[PDB]
Design a protein around this ligand. Structure first.
Ligand code: NAG
Ligand code: NAG
Lengths: 50, 86
């Protein structure tokens, strides 16, 4: 779901693309909500940290 | 409790002293509260008033003044009370 203004969503529940049980597993339709970027001084303008 | 871990906020008011020892009978003080959550702000209103009544709520107009506005940002769906056992 989306977020309300100034909501701090600290949750780490396993996201499901389709519909399948997940119990902390990385699998098809068992993905993590957490993603990251690898920022390097040589990355592009749009890829730099601000 | 017997712990304190991963705290993100703490507030303590000025210490006072109030009724603690065991008593049973008609109640003496009615302390009414309103608890609401608007856009992450937890608004607490309250009014303390003297009473001489054990039975149901007294009829009578009484306004609640605001006291606290706490910026917490927590998704609240359930709550529980805390009782004192002698
Ligand atoms: C609480 O503190 C621990 C430190 O051991 C940390 O690993 C954890 O991510 C913190 N947050 C929660 C919600 O437990
Ligand atoms: C708050 O938690 C409940 C789960 O108990 C969830 O259904 C609801 O969508 C959450 N609220 C927000 C704004 O994410």
């Amino acid at each position: 779901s989306n977020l309300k203004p100034f909501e701090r969503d600290i949750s780490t529940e396993i996201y499901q693309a389709g519909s399948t049980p997940c119990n902390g597993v990385e699998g098809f339709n068992c993905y993590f909500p957490l993603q990251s970027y690898g920022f390097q001084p040589t990355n592009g303008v749009g890829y730099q940290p601000y | 409790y017997s712990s304190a871990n991963n705290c993100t906020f703490e507030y303590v008011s000025q210490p006072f002293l109030m009724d603690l020892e065991g008593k049973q009978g008609n109640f003496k003080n009615l302390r009414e509260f309103v608890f609401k959550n608007i856009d992450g702000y937890f608004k607490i209103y309250s009014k303390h008033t003297p009473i001489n009544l054990v039975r149901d709520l007294p009829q009578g107009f009484s306004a609640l003044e605001p006291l606290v506005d706490l910026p917490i940002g927590i998704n609240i769906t359930r709550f529980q009370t805390l009782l004192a056992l002698h």
